[PDB]
């Protein structure tokens, strides 16, 4: 679709990943996370979600799992796809993202995820509420 490669170059992605590995010393962490999700394709969104986001899930670093803006950018990456339908990506985001995040780490994620859920997922509000309720 005449889409040229942006930040995901071999001389560019390594420089981004060398900065994102500090997690407390280098500011401008969420700026890249909001600016690495501006491609909106079928294979490029999969490429971005495979290189960094699946790797953050695999390592399980504390800073990105604690911040809810990371998961907000990750949900914004999938939800604005131009090839998928609505039901498949909605089932994807509800079923295979929200049970993956930690329940005790949701104290800083819920003020950032509640705005996204009130934004785009109106009927999925009470489902997310019953998952993060006060009693087991």
């Amino acid at each position: 679709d005449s889409q040229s490669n942006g930040l995901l170059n071999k001389e560019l992605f390594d420089k981004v990943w060398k900065r994102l590995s500090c997690k407390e010393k280098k500011s401008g962490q969420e700026i890249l996370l909001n600016n690495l999700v501006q491609f909106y394709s079928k294979d490029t969104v999969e490429f971005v979600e495979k290189n960094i986001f699946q790797k953050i899930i695999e390592f399980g670093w504390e800073y990105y799992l604690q911040n809810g803006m990371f998961w907000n950018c990750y949900c914004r990456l999938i939800y604005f796809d131009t090839s998928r339908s609505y039901l498949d990506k909605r089932q994807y985001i509800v079923r295979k993202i929200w049970p993956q995040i930690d329940k005790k780490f949701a104290q800083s994620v819920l003020p950032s995820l509640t705005e996204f859920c009130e934004s785009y997922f109106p009927e999925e509000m009470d489902t997310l509420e019953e998952m993060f309720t006060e009693e087991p």
């Binding site: 500011s27 401008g28 969420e30 700026i31 705005e115 009130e118």
Partner: protein
């Protein structure tokens, strides 16, 4: 008037207190008196200046002290001030309205459609400079935008003029605050004086502040002149300018775009 008299050839044992006692409280009221001493020795050179408020009392003191006994010698209290081509220019005053005040930094905005809010009107006038309040009168289709800097008000008027807000052209001018407008309305209902008051200054010099500079958000500051040292907070207090300011502003504008794409704020 502040008439000045120059006493000369005084004795060595005559301080400023004796000259102030001999000048003031003798059929006059001397406002100030200072004997010009040495720069590094501390001893008086025998000369002194006495500045009074009225010229007639200073003239009477100079006529009465011409030859008086001052610490064993003469006083010589003749006047110092009061056909060349070169004279200093003298001017009158514009009687201190809200147009001719250089410290007047609040802009009167009008021509609104009675539809814009206060946060949106803050968002119109936010990047021009730091701001203190954005309150508007109700039912009057106008408002008040007070900055801290005067160059920020110049930039706001030079940019925002002719800008239609909500399909209604704007009218930008000067104006007073709300309390001064209430005082002018209370003095204009009886029409006695209707006098205004000048806006207070900044107690200049101010080395740390840089005009037309905004900041929304430990601090190890080097206080270097190329960067910014101090700034006014956005409501309000005084903040030390950190290094992570453009990062916080970028995160804030990305959050503003994300919350404005959905409709959580209109500003």
């Amino acid at each position: 008037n502040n008439c000045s008299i120059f006493v000369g050839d005084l004795a060595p044992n005559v301080t400023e207190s004796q000259l102030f006692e001999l000048f003031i409280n003798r059929y006059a009221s001397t406002s100030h008196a200072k004997i010009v001493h040495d720069q590094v020795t501390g001893m008086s050179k025998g000369y002194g200046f006495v500045k009074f408020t009225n010229s007639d009392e200073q003239q009477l003191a100079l006529s009465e002290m011409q030859g008086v006994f001052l610490n064993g010698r003469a006083i010589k209290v003749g006047p110092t001030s009061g056909m060349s081509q070169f004279i200093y220019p003298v001017q009158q005053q514009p009687s201190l309205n809200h147009f001719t005040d250089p410290n007047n930094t609040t802009v009167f905005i009008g021509g609104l459609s009675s539809l814009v809010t206060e946060d949106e009107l803050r968002a119109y006038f936010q990047p021009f400079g730091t701001i203190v309040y954005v309150k508007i009168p109700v039912g009057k289709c106008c408002g008040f935008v007070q900055y801290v800097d005067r160059l920020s008000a110049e930039a706001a008027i030079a940019g925002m003029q002719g800008f239609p807000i909500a399909n209604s052209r704007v009218r930008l001018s000067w104006g007073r605050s709300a309390k001064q407008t209430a005082l002018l309305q209370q003095a204009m209902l009886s029409n006695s004086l209707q006098v205004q008051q000048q806006q207070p200054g900044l107690q200049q010099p101010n080395y740390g502040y840089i005009p037309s500079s905004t900041c929304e958000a430990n601090v190890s500051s080097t206080m270097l002149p190329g960067c910014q040292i101090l700034n006014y907070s956005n409501p309000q207090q005084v903040i030390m300018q950190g290094s992570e300011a453009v990062v916080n502003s970028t995160n804030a504008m990305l959050n503003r775009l994300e919350q404005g794409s959905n409709g959580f704020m209109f500003a």
